[PDB]
């Protein structure tokens, strides 16, 4: 794949061609869009050192994340008391999730599913509960409904994946499973990622409700009554919401990536905990605080990084580049050129 400059004559016949990448004179010809070059110095292209090799540096962690307990639990929590589990200090292989079942929902916000294995996360959190199938739509940012309003609210700027699958086999009983509860009455809508387990009677009316359970006085929690016979919309669905923080930091959770050796003073492609770039890594005198894992310049570009294995500060410098100018006496005079 090459760029050519073709001279079509009066009859449409290509009578000559210039290979733009052959030599500096042809590059000048292509930049000037002419087969003749006058005397002068012409800016043609940009010199750039290309990366010799690719380096990957990921934390020296091998133990897999406890996704098995999160997804293969015998009984999930109720939506009003949704369970939050901390996923940290482990390799997170998201490929195991796909194989389990034909998921009803594996919808990701702020990320793509296929790239989850290529990223590092500061502290993953899995929120698990059981809802009705028709309520599965309410598990999303900026949604309206009983589950979203009074049980589990996702933030508008939510970064993470919601995974919902049918649990009719494990959560439906012929007589009816009343274990799972949802909050139906609350004074105000829950703020995102907040749990209300209070069982105080809801006072819709003016008259007090001290357990009276009368009109306008109701117990906030209500049962689900899952049964196998009911349709898919009424069948129970198990939902796990994975919430992770993508802005780079000391990353406890990382994907299954095999780290290469750290090579300095050479222009290399580099991947530090999901941060990908091209540059020369060199020893740095910058002193990083323990929470600080990388440094940014005035353009919010990473100019210093901390090695996940050795905890060594490395300056990142762009690989050498510049402009290329072709000094030519003129194609009439000679085909010799000089390169600046």
């Amino acid at each position: 794949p090459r760029t050519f400059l073709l001279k079509y004559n009066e009859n449409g016949t290509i009578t000559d061609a210039v290979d733009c990448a052959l030599d500096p004179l042809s590059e000048t010809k292509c930049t000037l869009k002419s087969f003749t070059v006058e005397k002068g110095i012409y800016q043609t292209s940009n010199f750039r050192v290309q990366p010799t090799e690719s380096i990957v540096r990921f934390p020296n962690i091998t133990n897999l994340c406890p996704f098995d307990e999160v997804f293969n639990a015998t009984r999930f929590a109720s939506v009003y008391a949704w369970n939050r589990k901390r996923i940290s200090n482990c390799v997170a292989d998201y490929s195991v999730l796909y194989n389990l079942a034909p998921f009803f929902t594996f919808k990701c916000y702020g990320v793509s599913p296929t790239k989850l294995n290529d990223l590092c996360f500061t502290n993953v959190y899995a929120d698990s509960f059981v809802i009705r199938g028709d309520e599965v739509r309410q598990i999303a940012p900026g949604q309206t409904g009983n589950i979203a309003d009074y049980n589990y609210k996702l933030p508008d700027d939510f970064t993470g994946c919601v995974i919902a699958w049918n649990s009719n086999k494990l959560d439906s009983k012929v007589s009816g499973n009343y274990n799972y509860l949802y909050r139906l009455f609350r004074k105000s809508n829950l703020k995102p990622f907040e749990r209300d387990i209070s069982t105080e009677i809801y006072q819709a009316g003016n008259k007090p409700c001290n357990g009276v359970a009368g009109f306008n006085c109701y117990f906030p929690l209500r049962s689900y009554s899952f049964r196998p016979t009911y349709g898919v919309g009424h069948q129970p669905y198990r939902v796990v919401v994975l919430s992770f923080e993508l802005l780079h930091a000391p990353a406890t959770v990382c994907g299954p990536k095999k780290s290469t050796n750290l090579v300095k003073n050479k222009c290399v492609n580099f991947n530090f905990n999901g941060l990908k770039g091209t540059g020369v890594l060199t020893e740095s005198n910058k002193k990083f605080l323990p929470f600080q894992q990388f440094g940014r310049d005035i353009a919010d570009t990473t100019d210093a990084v901390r090695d996940p294995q050795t905890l060594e500060i490395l300056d990142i410098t762009p690989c050498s580049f510049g402009g290329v100018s072709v000094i030519t006496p003129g194609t009439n005079t000679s085909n010799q050129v000089a390169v600046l």
């Epitope: 049964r227 016979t229 009911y230 349709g231």
Partner: antibody, heavy 118, light 106 residues
Framework: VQLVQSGAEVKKPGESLKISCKGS?????????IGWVRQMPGKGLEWMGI????????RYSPSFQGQVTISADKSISTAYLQWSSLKASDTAMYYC?????????????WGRGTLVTV | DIQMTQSPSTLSASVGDRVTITCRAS??????LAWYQQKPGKAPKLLIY???SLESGVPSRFSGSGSGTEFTLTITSLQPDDFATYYC?????????FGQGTKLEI
Amino acid sequence: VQLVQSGAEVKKPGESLKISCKGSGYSFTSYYWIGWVRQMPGKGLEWMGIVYPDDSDTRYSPSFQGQVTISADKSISTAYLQWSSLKASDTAMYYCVRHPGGGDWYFDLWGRGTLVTV
Amino acid sequence: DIQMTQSPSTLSASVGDRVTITCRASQSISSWLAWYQQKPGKAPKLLIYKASSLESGVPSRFSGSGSGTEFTLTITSLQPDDFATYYCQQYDSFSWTFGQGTKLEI
């Protein structure tokens, strides 16, 4: 193409009453709406409710809603009319009825009947 | 809840006569009335659906007509088995309602 209902039975007030209707002679039994109609002694028919056996969806008349519970066991092609708190007003003879699909919502098939006297 | 009034409540006609029964609707239904034969101690059997077409196994003597609020059921020539209760029910909208019923005597 018949609907066989449970035998007529007599029960005292306050007891749980279950009436069974099994459909035979037609295929795709789960895809036919099956309902119950009440006839009081010396009174006209009153439609009570219908169920879709495949998905167990239930529709009820406003008068009988909550008072009755109508269920469908699709596995054995059966529909059950369940009454709680039997009372004197709960004395009538009940028909299991079948609905055609689409926009035809008459009762093409009627069961023999199930008298219940309290 | 569409209300159906069936007139007359009881009718007596000699065998072989032509008998007419009127079913009146609280609100108009677009030809969604069904006519049933209920003999004493028996299951109502569908005669007429859509108020025009008749069910299989029903002789041509039984007939139906009408539209909107007013519908009619007519027997041209009576038979001994013909005399029994007759019902009209709308199926235009849910919460289906039956007529009171007409008892036929010789």
